[PDB]
């Protein structure tokens, strides 16, 4: 036994769990609940069937996750999920072995979280898997995608998450008229859902225009968006490597953002924030193959939705994800 | 073995089975035949493969209610589906031990029933197994989901089920006018299902206007249906805590039912029984969080139908829930 | 082990197999094959995997049936498919030992039929089971669903199947005019699909109007079709119980079939074979509960479709059922 | 155990896997790399689970194409999957043994294709299985559908795959006029999808007209393109058996094509090229019986579509097929 043999032929078309991680825990009056900036935890449930005491074993599962990114990506390795849970990083730990009191049917495994610098262009997940031995007092489930948990980690700050698309267009400029000023595509191109991840609690970052995720070339192209206040206020938006991809502001307004809340009309419990980014106005050179330069103007409004179900007090609990 | 681990994920997305019971059971001629009036039983079927006689063991399983419940709610424990077969409880019992004939593929194991002054408020579940030894000459099906039996019981009387709400108006008092009268928001919120709870034979609760199951502060809000007939008459609207909710009926008309049927035109054995109840009038508080507080005019007509196969006598077994 | 038990939650919503075996097996010369009128065959075909010589036990399953009815129509006896194989039938035979070749991965297991006066108002159905043995170099496929076969046996002449039911009306007789002439309700009911069952070469039947094979008193409601020529003629329809059901042809045309053919557009080896009967007119009576009578006029064109694929050149065996 | 048993019963609905190969490998500069036309490979992934080496044995699975020939068209072998890994075929070879490096979770099996003088017409099929012992450090994946693989071979050269037939007129010759001209059909048959079968690397084939892979007499009918050029140039449009299917080209226009590029406006790195062959003009007689005879007129534009991924540099590999 020991190694499963299968053929490019794997569930893994399935598989990534996605959990939301506040970038910083902290209590109901703002102050630091993990030791700062940027520091975070989780807490992940472990299920548990039949009543005597119970030490469950957790492990780092490098294994699935490589699987798991050859069967859905294979050469293709810049869109591979990079693994979190790898030798000498510092971003995550858990115990690697948790107790279940005698009549109890859940066990939750604390996840510690540094996001300090984290890059999100990496698609950071942290694997794991329930360790199976003749020694231990229990089996990990027979289904081997019950007993494996590969978790897509989202840091969140008041920003971040999947912003509507719908206000932004993305238009081609196609040249120069007599006053210099730009020509451009009529049509444009609507990207319906744009990721906002986040850097640190008042900034967050996008691809540029229509790149995203699944762009073997991501990297070149994160537009940072910094929050200059906490409900209210402008934006500051900057590129990192702006000469490279020839990034360019619009200097005629400067974008701002509001936070607005709406109870729902059904579920009066549930709250709807929004995040609404106005006059965003820029332009950048995305480059398919060299020698190839289509230069885009991406402007318009930005708005992200959070439902807030006010039946958990924990805030940072209460998303419904 | 005896302990299977998992990460919250479980096929406990599905699992819950709705069995419908009489709150009284009775003969063609209307005499109680479990002892009176909210003494009721339910024969559950039991399917055995394979030429001996079968004694099968049926326990207890709070265990699989437990992953359910987290699985499905996980903190908000005010959603939970409660064990009604809980240690104490006197609404449910069981022979622990069923014999089958030996060339017999079935046996029905009768559960007996005790819903005088049950809360339906509750999510009350009975969660059972069939019981696996050495011991015993069978082995409970490898697929757990069949050997695992989690029924949401309903009781049932004439007047309770799931009644349209579709001639429910929920509208929002405003203010108030010169004259005192309420100014009501014109669109109104349609709960096209409004389930109608057993209280008792002659007795049923709806929760107020919208708040339903998912509520975790469902419980606040009972709004209470007397019929004061068999197949018509007037309808009692009451609140046992209609101080807390600002509960208030309007007086200028007092609600009535009746009970009336209909033919199937495709199966004319079918029979469409209604339960009409008319002029539904009244107002309560919605408190989402403590200083929020939303007045709600529910206001119109309840329509239950209920589907009897006449190609069954038993008229207790003749329903199509 | 030898026997799985489990709560009614069985995948028998699935594991009916219909089969259409010809009532008559003949030659393309007309002449029979199988000993006459109603004696016919089946070859079903018994799968292996893995170069030695395999012999193949196969026995009759009641068991598997047994779960199924009571799964799929409870106490419902009237509804229940019939056990075709059941101790001292006649219907069919088959053998309980098959031979595969060393390597070969097929073997034709082949069922002997004797299908005359045959009651189609029973929903025959041969249950088989592949046998498994310690002693056989073989094992039942783990999946007790391919190892298992449950056939519902439909015996098929050349007027048989399932009609269109959209050329015929079903008006209720709501009284009698001056002149005694029926007044007949405006609004019809349709049956999209009425099924033509066997009797034998030149008759079928169908149930009476809306009455279909879920019906537990089908039996009362049988109108014969007789087919007073090969491919055109007058149809003769009649009914055994005529005065119990009130049944009444109208005399004033005689119905009448004929078959036709048409190529398909897109595979023109595929031919379309109508049988089309017109003038189809007669009353009777629906009796759902004693004291109730709706009396019911069926009138109108009854059209077969049936498939043959001439890329099969057996025609028996051509059809695209 | 050995053999599993199970009857017309097997998820061989299921089953076939589409392999892309291109007809000559060669290199950025279009040398050949696998010993000139028609000689090619494919490197095929192979997933391990769990620190050692491990030696994966691969074998020819006869067995599991032939269940699945048997379970998809029983009796119409002429429409079977033709077993490419047989006894004494040089179509295709691969390594019975291969090595996986300790900390590696994948290894790829190096197939290698002589693909000179394959007829397509035959649905040219390599089967294979991961070969389970007690001597091997692994186990084949429980589920038999992931250590298997069944891999239906497509050849492509510039100019083949699945063709648009919307361009694509069918018409019927009815008779002729007093100037010889034909009579047809004013409606057409539209083949939404044609398939171009790869020949060598300047010639397809595709069935003539409607007739498709489904067809039992398909070999009868193939229609060979040869394009007389790289990138644009006139086709020679034939029929080895031009005078058995009253084969006929149209002397008026003779047929061209040419390959165009245009980028999508999602994803700016992915490339639409097109083959777009014009004024497709001949006739042909199918014979869906003896004696039968139907005369087509088939004629219009071809329009192929391929999108290459310029992510992958390969060429050969960034087909998005
Ligand atoms: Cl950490
Ligand atoms: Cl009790
Ligand atoms: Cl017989
Ligand atoms: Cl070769």
Redesign the interface.
């Known amino acids: 036994?020991?190694?499963?043999?299968?053929?490019?032929?794997?569930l893994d078309s399935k598989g990534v769990?996605n959990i939301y991680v506040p970038y910083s825990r902290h209590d109901a009056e703002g102050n630091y609940a993990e030791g700062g900036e940027g520091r975070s935890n989780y807490q992940?449930?472990?299920?548990?069937?039949?009543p005597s005491n119970?030490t469950?074993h957790v492990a780092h599962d490098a294994?699935?996750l490589?699987?798991l990114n050859?069967?859905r990506y294979?050469?293709?390795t810049?869109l591979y999920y990079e693994d979190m849970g790898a030798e000498g990083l510092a971003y995550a730990s858990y115990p690697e072995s948790l107790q279940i009191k005698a009549g109890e049917?859940?066990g939750l495994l604390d996840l510690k979280f540094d996001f300090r610098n984290i890059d999100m262009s990496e698609k950071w997940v942290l694997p794991?898997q329930?360790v199976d031995d003749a020694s231990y007092?229990?089996?990990?489930?027979?289904?081997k995608?019950?007993?494996?948990?590969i978790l897509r980690i989202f840091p969140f700050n008041d920003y971040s998450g999947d912003y509507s698309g719908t206000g932004i267009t993305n238009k081609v400029v196609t040249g120069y008229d007599g006053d210099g000023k730009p020509i451009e595509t009529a049509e444009s191109?609507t990207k319906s859902s744009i990721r906002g991840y986040v850097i640190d609690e008042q900034t967050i970052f996008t691809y540029a225009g229509?790149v995203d995720e699944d762009?073997?070339?991501r990297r070149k192209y994160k537009i940072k968006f910094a929050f200059n206040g906490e409900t209210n206020g402008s934006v500051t938006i900057s590129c990192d490597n702006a000469e490279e991809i020839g990034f360019e502001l619009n200097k005629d307004v400067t974008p701002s953002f509001r936070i607005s809340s709406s109870?729902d009309?059904?579920?009066?419990?549930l709250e709807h924030r929004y995040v609404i980014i106005n006059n965003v106005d820029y332009y950048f050179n995305?480059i398919?193959?060299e020698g190839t330069i289509?230069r885009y103007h991406v402007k318009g409004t930005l708005t992200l939705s959070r439902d807030i179900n006010?039946?958990?007090p924990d805030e940072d609990?209460a998303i419904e994800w």
């Open positions: 036994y020991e190694h499963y043999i299968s053929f490019s032929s794997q769990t992940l449930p472990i299920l548990v069937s039949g119970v469950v294994d699935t490589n699987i050859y069967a294979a050469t293709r810049e049917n859940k794991l329930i007092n229990y089996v990990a489930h027979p289904r995608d019950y007993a494996k948990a191109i229509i762009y073997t070339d109870m009309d059904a579920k009066p419990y995305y398919p193959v289509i006010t039946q958990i609990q």
